[model samples]
Target chain A: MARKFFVGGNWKCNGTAEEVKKIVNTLNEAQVPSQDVVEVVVSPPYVFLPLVKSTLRSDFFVAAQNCWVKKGGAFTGEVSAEMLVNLDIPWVILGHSERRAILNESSEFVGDKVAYALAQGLKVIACVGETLEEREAGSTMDVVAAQTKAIADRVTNWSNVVIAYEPVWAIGTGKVASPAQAQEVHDELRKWLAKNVSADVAATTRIIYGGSVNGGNDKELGGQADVDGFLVGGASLKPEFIDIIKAAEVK
Target chain B: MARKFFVGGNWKCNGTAEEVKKIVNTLNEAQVPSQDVVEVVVSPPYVFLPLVKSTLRSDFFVAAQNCWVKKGGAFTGEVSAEMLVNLDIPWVILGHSERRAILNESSEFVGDKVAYALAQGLKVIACVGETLEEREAGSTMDVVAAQTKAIADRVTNWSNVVIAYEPVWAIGTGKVASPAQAQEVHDELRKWLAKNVSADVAATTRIIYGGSVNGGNDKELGGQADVDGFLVGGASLKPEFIDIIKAAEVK
Candidate 1:
């Protein structure tokens, strides 16, 4: 239980540079409990990355929503993992359900990106989820196993990786998965890790749930033994976002 | 020919905000002479637009590399033409070969995007190109025709559009098209505009060539009867980039 819980807000192409400053300013001034070992990072669009980072304090970190595989070249409209590292950006979320589905990135490609990000010294918030159809087809566990296998096959360590089990069906649909249901998948993931990697690795790795998580429900799920934190989506836009993290921190 | 030649430098996903300021500063301070009739615009990445525009004067306009068909949406990681209109970025270069080859975008997808950009009162540097395979099969004209037709079918006037005929094979390959070869295709496009759209439209639109356009050969090819300007690639990064523009102007 020594691993500190972590939550990240992914404001993907959501705000202007001016709005980002306003949101980060609100976070910098907010009061959070000191005893709680909770870390918060915000990933804004590449356009606002430098602006947001310069304005925020050292306590909070920032990330990029998506990154290209290469160091840099003529890959128009793509931010590179190396560029983020050059700017000292610490974390990056890969394989978000939206990016996976909308952009047609494969599991192996996500794993490759994760390995590159880790090599670049970035904290990787790697996401895995089955689509609504895959859930309906009763292949949820199979899909998770496949995604994890891709990562394990390529990556030798899980220390820098945070596993986010976001069900595509619930994301942005306003259908919050009940604690029991979330626990069911997380429990399955724990057992899978125990069998596949190691018991210690399973216990230490942060297993965060992210699907329509708002201020009201973040704590109920956070209280669960398996639910470490959240990879928050929309609710991260408000000051209540900080409230959700505080709720998670309270004993 | 009342239509003066137009050259645009698209700095696609290349520089940081600081680097952009340096580039703009260099442009402002350089000894490059401006022939007002020959239009020059630089499309920096969307993040640097506000910064670039602040320093880039009226004589040189600014454009975006790509924009979404819809004005606004949940489609993260895309710039909209309406936002460009609001920001006073008057032109957008749509459907370049890189976007087509790398991003899985079709000619029709580019057409829809063009329609949206024009509707918002933004001038467009619309691109049409044929790949190496298409050129090898001697189907370059047909491929370019289909691409041009997709947009010409939707437009009633050509005032806001500049046609950039970039052959994908020649782009970034250092294989400059011979003057006759480029003019033949340009004539074909003008013929398409004459028959499918209007004779006045065919006569007036500035049909330019893009690809490895540089100082050595731009004078010979850029001065061709139908070739109105050059859209530079790697040469856009050099101090010599202005030299190529200067060379075209002298002719």
Candidate 2:
């Protein structure tokens, strides 16, 4: 009945096909402490999805790094969410900042991805965050609220949605959200979700933080009432990733 | 031996895993009238490349719609030339107009693709052509030459290179270049190849036309001296695709 902490790694455009096997084997061989109560998922590049999916343990589910809105057609170099759903890939991290910044994808586009993914019966790690300027301008909540609402606008149910609030500034820069800052925004998000979406959805939805989520800061943020877990980035690559997961174990 | 007429169908980002079997079967069953001697190749979407490659008739080779400049790694949602080559997929289409126009792939980017594909032992269908506006401005040759020279600067052997002159104006527009017009550009390309590259390279290199290549025009264009083959587009979806291929056969 309680929400489970989920930590997902966006190994964005990283590693070779050979490295996927190596990484999976490492995960399988590593003694991931049973105390790590969080659910962990890693999304690799699409090329290695099926291969890596089969190699990883049954408990460790595979995700597509990205999927196209359309099932099939002239959208070159994009995978479709329909295909992902049919293939039984359980989770998709929609609207990662890299896609937003580099590919010029708008929040509305991310919203469409969320709606499309959710409709196809896939769990959505719908990411929303603020740029440094927005944060500095004291509009972090406004930015995050607007992005979350965009997806909520189309998605009728938030039962399978996990919201990851990854601040664009702190991402990969080693600057992390202090516990108080993360919790305050997260609490605000919970209130917003309860008010706008539904009370049940708000209570159940995991509001994870993602920004330089290292082992050092993992437990500090984990202790926050509203801070669900993390969408780990750089730290996810290290052995400390498991430690961070354990640090965030729901009590 | 005279150069064998060739035609390639690049079904970019089209079809599903299930559709691949149906399409390949249609191609295999086609009544390819021996009006001319021709080589037909099909470049399916990368997701189904291995499926189409291993199962498609041995006479018809498989091609990747596009491949990465690198042999492998870090570029998400990209098929690498080395991966395709390792899989024994011999041909790759490097610079489709859609990739250029939509994805902002520059002429230099395509040139890098060509060099990368060739280095990995994959033959390259290095596409080049002008936009409708560029054609109207009479700068078609200039544009094509610059595109060709970008690759020509790095290319030593043209044996593995098929220069596809696909005018953006004709692709998917149902508008095609008149036979004389197509040959004029093809002849100019050969002349430029001779001057900038080498006679040996130029002679061996297949300077093929693309865009709206249907059975009706395949015969006219196929009869031209320098127009060696075609990179068929929409027609590739129909059984008539084989008809076009047969029409292009070298008499």
Candidate 3:
């Protein structure tokens, strides 16, 4: 396989300083595959990013959960991509369903954020997804396609971007998407990239699955032809995250 | 006059790590009033909170531009108040006009945020103001009153909160609000507090002015009866912020 298995732990708005230190210790002690085989990244809240970056093991990198849409200036309460790059953070998770739904981030806005983050030398775990309502209405494909197309139009290079296909309905809800359902979306997403961007990007880019993903389901999910890895949620907070990363061997 | 004057530097979404270091250096070197005569706090973006906390002078403190509305969980991209407290950050600025206007944070929502941040043991520079449209319509007092009422309803302790009156039309637009104009709003807000909250809170609470405030105008603004201090914006990045703090002698 051309793409390496990628596992990202998004510690969304969680962890105190000592708790973060403990989590970092656990990750540092884990015996996972080499960085060449399974690349791991941990996203912490902005306040602890420097602590995590300086203290975490060298092989596993650090990411910011989100960054501002553009350059830093007068926008209050927003941390810009430049700030993340300044801190030497390598990856950012953008357009998470939680932000889109709760904070009213539109597909176009998320796409703009993705473009700006990349421009600032940050790799992106660009997320695309559909809600329960959209899925039930059979608009899931159209929704994600438009979401992908927004980033596709703005992005000049796809090399630093990994697409995470997370259905909003499954995220943090404990409603796991069966392996077949996960594969279906990943396959279509890959095809969308091929037809919309280029065949090279479709083949080379890792289309990972997210939403209620855990150690128990990661093996079969990662076994899918297009399902390269995961962007984990709740389970990422526990030691179970190590198991999920270990299961990336199935890729 | 029992209320000690306060001067805060809100470095909103700006500054690279080196720039932050230089600013901290400048702040540490400045000879301002002792901590007892006046209080000072500098707010960097979330990513720089820890850095500023560790590097700044002992008398001065560090603040986060904003924090999560409540205990952090699955809210992506939010830095929790608990996280700020965990990092030993003493203060947080909430409900800035920028977030209210651009981010659609309603008055009620900002109040909720203030209540939550205070609950987590973080002091607050809670902001309240009116937009250009509302100001033009002669509803500035009505708007500021409603905004204050929201927080006043939720807050039991006024000791930990400093209200910043930043007029939307003046912020970052290089348009300054006259001392009289600022005093009027602050007076009304204090009286509102007296009537609705308590007379003791009204007398003791510090209602600071914000928006295009620089060293040149800090003296006049700080001279107003109800205006206790300032929440400096762009000028906070420059060396003149020291002048603004020096003018606190007017209080």
Candidate 4:
């Protein structure tokens, strides 16, 4: 139960270099829980990673939203995992539902990326969630179970991984997952990890919550047992992200 | 014809920041045709754009390997066309066979991207090529015609577009297209452009050759009447890229 809270901003595919610097300036000036209590990281599109990495506060870190799964080579138009390590970029967000659905990245492919990124010495914010159709079909746990198993098959170490549960339905729909809902899935993931992986790995791993805007619910979710942090969307671009990061203090 | 010879290196998801700097140094030191004789630009992965743009020779510009088809927001793992413009990156490579086949980017989708990137005031290196199957089926002109027309449908001004013709089979297969082969497709494209778009665009546009590495063959390819320039691949990362740029001298 010593897992530190983690708040990550997935800027997705937004921001100019100037806009990235502006956001980094805000994060640098903000007062939030210290490193021991909360690990804060922001993910930007690959184009702005250098500007953000140089400008953001040292206590916080930066992540690339995506990278090529394999070694750097002739994969046209992809940023490689090796390049991220070369840039001294410490973390990467992978297995985003958008890529899985829109870009046809299967769970198996995502597992390969998780293993490759980790093997390249980069930490990963691995995402898993069911679509609204699966949610309405009452197969939510089954869906996440399969996704988690995909990563578990490829990943042996959970020390450098953070699982962010963002139901595809809740994202950008303004349908924030309630604390009850957040804790429900996080707990399932814990059990799944313990049974399928190992008890210690499950216990030590940080399972964060993400979907829509965490908003006022961040405080309530922070106080929940399994809700360790968040992966924010729209609010991450605004000053409101600072308040969202403070949710860790409530824990 | 008033066509300026253009040589572009499609770095294709390769190179560390250090490696990129090393390559830029090689490019800056090598004596090549002036900017007016050959428009020398290099495409780097989005991560290295800032570094290359800052360090590369002033006359030689930088291009992004690819960009999001539309605007930036809410699209996880995709860099937007607007972000490229915001970063002052002048050129983008779109509709490469890799993206078209692996990522399922339809020709129509690539056209939408061309139109959008152009609308954002970024120049585009639009790629059109037939797969091995299409070429063997003797439908090469038809295939590129559809791909080119997709772009032409969304585009009006050909002033800022460079058409790169690279047959899929020839790429990285150590199968270089002969000057006669290069001229054949280039002429077909020119004829297509003249009939569909305008005669001026057909006469003035730089239709470049790309497929496999341009080796000693570059000199011969440059002598072809329709071979205005080249979009280089593997040779781009080597000191030999200097020789590839010198192809403009033969032209």
Estimate TM-scores for all models.
0.91, 0.81, 0.96, 0.96
Fraction of true contacts kept, per model? 0.29, 0.23, 0.89, 0.90
TM-score of 3: 0.96
Worst 10 residues of 1 chain B by lDDT: B70-79
lDDT tens digits, residues B171-201, model 1? Answer: 6566666778888888888898889888888
* Per-residue lDDT over B9-125 for candidate 2, one digit per residue giving the tens place of the 0 to 100 score: 878666666667788898878767443467778987655666787788878888887877765533334567767755678998888887788667889988998988898899888
**Model 1: per-residue lDDT, tens digit, A53-92?**
8888778888887777656567655666777776678888
Order by lDDT, highest first: 3, 4, 1, 2
Restricting to chain A, the TM-score for each candidate equals: 0.95, 0.93, 0.97, 0.96
Whose DockQ is greatest here?
A: 3
How many Å off is the CA of B23 in candidate 2?
A: 3.8
| Per-residue lDDT of candidate 4, residues B131-239 (tens digit) | 8778889999999999999999999888899999987866656665677888899998899999999988899889988775466688788878888888888888989
lDDT of 1: 0.79
Model 4: pairs clashing at backbone N, Cα or C within 3 Å: none
User: Which candidate, 2 or 4, has the higher TM-score?
Assistant: 4
What are the candidates' interface root-mean-square deviations?
A: 2.8, 3.2, 0.8, 0.8
Error of 2 at A160 (Å): 3.7
Which number leads on lDDT? 3
Q: Write the per-residue lDDT of candidate 2 for residues A99-183, one digit (tens) a residue.
A: 6775566888889888888888888888888888788899988998998888889898888888988778665565666778888
Q: After superposition, how far is residue B5 of candidate 2 from its true place, in Å?
A: 3.8
Model 2: residue A144 alpha-carbon error in angstroms: 3.9
